[PDB]
Amino acid sequence: DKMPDWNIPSLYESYKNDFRIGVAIPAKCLSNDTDRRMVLKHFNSITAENEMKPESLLAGQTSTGLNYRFSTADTFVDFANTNNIGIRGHTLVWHSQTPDWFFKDSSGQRLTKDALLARLKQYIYDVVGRYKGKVYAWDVVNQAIDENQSDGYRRSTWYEICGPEYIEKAFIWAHEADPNAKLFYNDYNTEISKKRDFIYNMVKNLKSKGIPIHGIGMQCHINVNWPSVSEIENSIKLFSSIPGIEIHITQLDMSLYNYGSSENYSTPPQDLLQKQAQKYKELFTMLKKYTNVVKCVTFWGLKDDYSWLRSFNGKNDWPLLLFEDYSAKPAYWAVIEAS
Numbered sequence: 001d002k003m004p005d006w007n008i009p010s011l012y013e014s015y016k017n018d019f020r021i022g023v024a025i026p027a028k029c030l031s032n033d034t035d036r037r038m039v040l041k042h043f044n045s046i047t048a049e050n051e052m053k054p055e056s057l058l059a060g061q062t063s064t065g066l067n068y069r070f071s072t073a074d075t076f077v078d079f080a081n082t083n084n085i086g087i088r089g090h091t092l093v094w095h096s097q098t099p100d101w102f103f104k105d106s107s108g109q110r111l112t113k114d115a116l117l118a119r120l121k122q123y124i125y126d127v128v129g130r131y132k133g134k135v136y137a138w139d140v141v142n143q144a145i146d147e148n149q150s151d152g153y154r155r156s157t158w159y160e161i162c163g164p165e166y167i168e169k170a171f172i173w174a175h176e177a178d179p180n181a182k183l184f185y186n187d188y189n190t191e192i193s194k195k196r197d198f199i200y201n202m203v204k205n206l207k208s209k210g211i212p213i214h215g216i217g218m219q220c221h222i223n224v225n226w227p228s229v230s231e232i233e234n235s236i237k238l239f240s241s242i243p244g245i246e247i248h249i250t251q252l253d254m255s256l257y258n259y260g261s262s263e264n265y266s267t268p269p270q271d272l273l274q275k276q277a278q279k280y281k282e283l284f285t286m287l288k289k290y291t292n293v294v295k296c297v298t299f300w301g302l303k304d305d306y307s308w309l310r311s312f313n314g315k316n317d318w319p320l321l322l323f324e325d326y327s328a329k330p331a332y333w334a335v336i337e338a339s
């Protein structure tokens with residue numbers, strides 16, 4: 001019952017003078033003819049949804065270092081490179097998406113700070129080096145900020161063993177391994193004022209002291225009720241006040257539900273689909289005011305039944321621009337209208 005329309009306006013072409021338009025996809029899309037054609041019609045950047053995370057690239061360890069499994073990730077990078085589109089690297093440092101043995105030695109022992117930092121250098125050199133010149137942007141560090149901590153830092157194993165030095169060292173080493181990649185700090189809920197302030201100061205201070213961070217990634221996992229487009233704009237205004245910092249919108253999607261709500265729909269309510277469309281229109285009208293700093297906007301999924309949100313919350317959701325049958329949503333037409 002698939003109903004892709006090959007003749008409607010290309011998303012990225014509609015925004016060609018504003019910013020790249022990207023999509024996160026899983027590996028299965030690369031072997032599906034309909035998915036591939038839809039990706040290349042509408043998007044000029046991709047992100048591997050899961051297949052370039054540390055848990056996906058790491059195969060294990062021995063007495064002398066790390067062992068990798070790159071076959072699937074190679075297919076993503078080759079797909080982008082041979083089809084003249086960019087691929088954003090998701091992600092070098094991300095505690096929850098890293099296996100627990102990574103933080104212990106081959107004898108099952110928890111690593112000292114110096115041993116873990118040495119392992120981090122090895123990982124970054126190996127992964128960024130393999131793809132040197134082929135990944136235009138890396139999310140180097142993801143989700144290091146926790147606004148309920150007094151100093152703002154998430155108390156992950158990275159922080160507990162290394163303190164905050166792991167953040168700046170990850171950027172230094174990534175920039176050594178591929179000097180031409182744009183390097184991002186990536187996070188979510190950047191519209192919570194206290195978190196925004198922690199991120200702003202962290203990145204400002206890194207940049208001041210010469211750390212090669214080039215951008216902030218705002219995930220923008222949002223919903224039809226929160227945050228307001230004005231709040232997203234306030235984040236863009238503050239982050240873009242840092243000289244030399246660009247912005248990518250890295251994982252945009254818009255749940256039809258409030259977070260923590262027990263609503264559960266079998267079919268998408270039309271009034272929420274209209275609220276979604278109007279908010280996507282407002283969002284993109286706002287983003288077009290900041291094309292000097294916002295260089296890429298990536299949607300976290302090709303179509304609604306591919307959304308991570310369905311498994312994550314255990315219910316149907318319709319957060320993206322295409323329906324399950326590949327057909328355009330009101331949201332799609334709103335994004336085209338905003339262009």
Ligand SMILES: OC[C@H]1O[C@@H](O[C@H]2[C@H](O)[C@@H](O)[C@H](O[C@H]3[C@H](O)[C@@H](O)[C@H](O[C@H]4[C@H](O)[C@@H](O)[C@H](O[C@H]5[C@H](O)[C@@H](O)[C@H](O[C@H]6[C@H](O)[C@@H](O)[C@H](O)O[C@@H]6CO)O[C@@H]5CO)O[C@@H]4CO)O[C@@H]3CO)O[C@@H]2CO)[C@H](O)[C@@H](O)[C@@H]1O
Pocket residue numbers: 049050142188189192219221222223226251258259308
């Ligand atoms: O991670 C495994 C799967 O990841 C998927 O993709 C990831 C991506 O790779 C990653 O980079 C990133 O990570 C997510 C985190 O791992 C996850 O824990 C986090 O949960 C968020 C949720 O996304 C977010 O929408 C939610 O927002 C709430 C907020 O918590 C709440 O405080 C706020 O409250 C406000 C009130 O609503 C308002 O009335 C009042 O005025 O102000 C309040 C604020 O003070 O409301 C918002 C929404 O209503 O918070 C939770 C955590 O608390 O989400 C991260 C990203 O959002 O993003 C992707 C998602 O995981 C992969 O695709 C998949 O394949 C992997 O298996």
